[PDB]
């Protein structure tokens, strides 16, 4: 099954998203901090298929997280969940190599579609 890494500093949100993604048929790894996220990613950069992160995180933002992932795995699909005031950065992220950004509130359908498209892209690159 696809393996997804989800990064959010809000435990309950992280839990809700994990639940939804498991129901959607994904294996899910979670990180409650940007450093933990990049750590887990580095240790599994060859088995992770998609990374989902909130645009805003303490210390390192989704932008910083995105940039670091791209340096390690240039073709890794990174999806950013965006809220108020993140629009400008979201657009920049797309120019920075992000796969897609989803404006909150994000629906289960939005996420499942984006993940499916990310997996298809990975397969095209094999």
Technique used: X-ray
Q: Which residue, among 21, 42, 22, 41, has the nearest Cα to 31 in the 3D structure?
A: 41
Breaks (C-N over 2.5 A) in the chain follow: none
Spatial strand order in the sheet of 77-82:
27-31, 3-7, 50-54, 77-82, 100-103
Task: Indicate the resolution in Å.
Answer: 1.9
Give the domain extent around 66. 1-126
Domain count, the chain: 1
Give the CATH number, domain containing residue 29.
Answer: 3.40.50.2300
């Amino acid at each position: 099954l696809a393996k997804i890494l989800v990064i959010d500093d809000e435990s309950t949100i992280l839990q809700n998203i994990k639940f939804l993604l498991e129901i959607d048929g994904n294996e899910v790894l979670t990180a409650s901090s940007s450093t933990e996220g990049l750590r887990i990613f580095t240790e599994n950069c060859n088995s992770i298929d998609v990374v989902i992160t909130d645009m805003k995180m303490p210390k390192l933002s989704g932008m910083d997280i995105l940039r670091e992932i791209k340096k390690i795995t240039p073709h890794m699909a990174v999806i950013i969940l965006t809220g108020h005031g993140d629009l400008d950065n979201a657009i920049l992220a797309m120019k920075e190599g992000a796969f897609e950004y989803l404006r909150k509130p994000v629906t289960a359908q939005d996420l499942s579609i984006a993940i499916n498209n990310a997996i298809n892209r990975k397969k095209l690159l094999m």
